[PDB]
């Protein structure tokens, strides 16, 4: 129902969309594996993620990778809050742009090489303003979610239109 405070720990599922809780904590919070959750960090920042259970996670800790920590402006050992987010809708359209200093000199089709395999059949939840790192080939590029419909939260479903067009941003 309400936000629950937990201590940030390092990910064992190294994926931008996944946070891990212990099974006792998931039971306490009425969460099912695969639920969408809303995380609140510092500087008014938020993130939406998929929660999974983890038999190595301390009860009062939450595991998340560095991409999510950076989106929340937190470090390991900081405290964030987690709450269920079951009302997030499938996105009609999303608009993402690469970050200039991660695409320097990169040519080709950013959707085909990076975004399409990243989102494919994953139902990733995303928030407007998210920065996420995607590897394609052997280069890793950062993208920013510049707009979503609906806003500011949506789930990138198979039918969600993914737009990536225009200058890299700073």
């Amino acid at each position: 129902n309400r936000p629950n405070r937990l201590i940030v720990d390092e990910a064992i599922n190294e994926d931008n969309s996944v946070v891990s809780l212990s099974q006792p904590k998931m039971d306490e919070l009425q969460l099912f594996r695969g639920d969408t959750v809303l995380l609140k960090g510092k500087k008014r920042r938020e993130a939406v993620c998929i929660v999974l259970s983890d038999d190595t996670c301390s009860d009062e800790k939450i595991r998340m990778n560095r991409v999510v920590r950076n989106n929340l402006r937190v470090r390991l050992g900081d405290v964030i809050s987690i709450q269920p987010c079951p009302d997030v809708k499938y996105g009609k359209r999303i608009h993402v742009l690469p970050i200039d200093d991660t695409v320097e000199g990169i040519t080709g089709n950013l959707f085909e090489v990076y975004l399409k395999p990243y989102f494919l059949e994953a139902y990733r939840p995303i928030r407007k303003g998210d920065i996420f790192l995607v590897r394609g080939g052997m280069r890793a590029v950062e993208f920013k979610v510049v707009e979503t419909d609906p806003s500011p939260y949506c789930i990138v479903a198979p039918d969600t239109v993914i737009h990536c067009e225009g200058e890299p941003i700073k």
Partner: peptide, 15 residues
């Protein structure tokens, strides 16, 4: 359905 989303997420992210 919410449950098809859950099935696909667990297939992709938890084996």
């Amino acid at each position: 359905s919410p449950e098809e989303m859950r099935r696909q997420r667990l297939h992709r992210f938890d084996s």
